[PDB]
Design a protein around this ligand. Structure first.
Ligand code: HEM
Ligand SMILES: CC(=O)[C@@]1(O)CC[C@H]2[C@@H]3CCC4=CC(=O)CC[C@]4(C)[C@H]3CC[C@@]21C
Length: 442
């Protein structure tokens, strides 16, 4: 009993792949097989099927596949995000996860506060001007992850311009069609590809960045004490966990931690531009509690619910990452053979009317206490949960909390920014370019 096979091939060509995938549940239910590219792959479109796979049968669906680009990004050192589930992988995740949690425990909260403080002051420079916020949230969250991974040396040797430019190049190349098409149609590897050589140049530049940073930490490090995440990770190292593991864990922190959180922030802005009743309510809630520390989260319940909603309705990683079946198993009473690739449709699953009534509507009050509905999972779940989720949820709180108290968000000009996501971009859910006006005071 395999999951039902949906007819057709090259479904890839559909714009809004996660919303098209939700469309096939019409005939085939939450769990079905379909041919993306050449390959047969099962897709999950419900919170039940996703949690049943990822949480319940924990180890059965914790793997990753290995198409061309996965090998290509990690020819020197092992990658964490694209690494298959093993003992060595589990230690890999544990270390970098302890680096985020314990390593920067005292500094994570102040680094965020201070950097977003300077963001608001840069916003201050042009009071009426329409601002291309997207890039400004991108520089913020990139600076934050850089400072927390690499330390003081960033604003000293003035490394932020060159690092941002590198981090951006790397993701932007990799997620583009000319590179992604090779993972699904692997015979295309033999036909010449400028794109893949644009990628190799980006890999080379990111590897030079991380490695120079790695040397400089090693030579200055103190045996008991840790300044940032690389200090912590270097110290918990040396199938043993090597310095190559640290190198890639930094790569995953950098690339994983800019565009994801920054775009979520951008989406929140667009939603508030469409909902100025909510903006005022949020502002008036902030006025009633001169910053709010992250320790005082409970004290802003509507703000938290608004963040939860942004995550529900617009998850920035809408298809998560592909999963691989580690041993023969089953989801929803269908036989799942070993090595079959699983696509966890998070955007689709959050649009379920079974779970979230009026599921297409930006409705923050939905997450408020009477009859509160089930928690969304924009960060995924199980063994493969987003590594930088704590850092992200902090960044989201501090940045919106300070933007709203210090400013009012007005539309760029006459018409509100398009809420519809860019069509062919699935990897990162990005919105159509927009400007916003920031006017003191909230
Ligand atoms: C709103 C912000 C963010 C969202 C919605 C988000 C979402 C996700 C999702 C859905 C996955 C894949 C889950 C799966 O494979 O089942 C993921 C993986 C990951 N994320 Fe994030 N993420 C966010 C921010 C960050 C940040 C800030 C970092 C790092 C600083 C980060 C690092 C990672 C890493 C390293 C993985 C791979 C983990 C693994 O493969 O097990 N993410 N994230
Ligand atoms: C949310 C997500 O999925 C992530 O942001 C979390 C981890 C991210 C990896 C990290 C390493 C990497 C190395 C490269 O040189 C190309 C781009 C990737 C594959 C990069 C893309 C986006 C990922 C997959």
């Amino acid at each position: 009993k395999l999951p039902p096979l949906a007819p057709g091939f090259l479904h890839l060509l559909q714009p809004d792949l996660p919303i098209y995938l939700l469309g096939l549940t019409q005939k085939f239910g939450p769990i079905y097989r379909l041919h993306l590219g050449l390959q047969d792959v099962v897709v999950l479109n419900s919170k039940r099927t996703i949690e049943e796979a990822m949480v319940k049968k924990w180890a059965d669906f914790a793997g990753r596949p290995e198409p061309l680009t996965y090998k290509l990004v990690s020819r020197n050192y092992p990658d964490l995000s694209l690494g298959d589930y093993s003992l060595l992988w589990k230690a890999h995740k544990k270390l970098t996860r302890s680096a985020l949690l314990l390593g920067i425990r005292d500094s994570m909260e102040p680094v965020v506060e201070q950097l977003t403080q300077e963001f608001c002051e840069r916003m201050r420079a042009q009071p009426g001007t329409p601002v291309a916020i997207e890039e400004e949230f991108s520089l913020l969250t990139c600076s934050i992850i850089c400072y927390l991974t690499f330390g003081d040396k960033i604003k000293d040797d003035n490394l932020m311009p060159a690092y941002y430019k590198c981090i951006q190049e790397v993701l932007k190349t990799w997620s583009h069609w000319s590179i992604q098409i090779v993972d699904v149609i692997p015979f295309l590897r033999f036909f010449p590809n400028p794109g893949l050589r644009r990628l190799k140049q980006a890999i080379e530049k990111r590897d030079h960045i991380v490695e120079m940073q790695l040397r400089q930490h090693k030579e200055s490090l103190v045996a008991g004490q840790w300044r940032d995440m690389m200090d912590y990770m270097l110290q918990g190292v040396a199938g043993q966990l090597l310095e190559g593991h640290v190198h890639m864990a930094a790569v995953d922190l950098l690339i994983g931690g800019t565009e994801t959180t920054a775009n979520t922030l951008s989406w929140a802005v667009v939603f508030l531009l469409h909902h100025p009743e909510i903006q005022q309510r949020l502002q008036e809630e902030l006025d009633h509690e001169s910053r709010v520390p992250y320790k005082d989260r409970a004290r802003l319940p509507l703000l938290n619910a608004t963040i939860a909603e942004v995550l529900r309705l617009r998850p920035v990683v809408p298809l998560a990452l592909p999963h691989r079946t580690t041993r023969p198993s089953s989801i929803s009473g269908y036989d799942i053979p070993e090595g079959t690739v699983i696509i966890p449709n998070l955007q689709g699953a959050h649009l379920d009317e079974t779970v979230w009534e009026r599921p297409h509507e930006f409705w923050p009050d939905r997450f408020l206490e009477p009859g509160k509905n089930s928690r969304a999972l924009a960060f995924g779940c199980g063994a493969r949960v987003c590594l930088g989720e704590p850092l992200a949820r902090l960044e989201l709180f501090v940045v919106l909390t300070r933007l709203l108290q210090a400013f009012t968000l007005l539309p760029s000009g006459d018409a509100l920014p398009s809420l519809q996501p860019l069509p062919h971009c699935s990897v990162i859910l990005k919105m159509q370019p927009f400007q916003v006006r920031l006017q003191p005071r909230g």
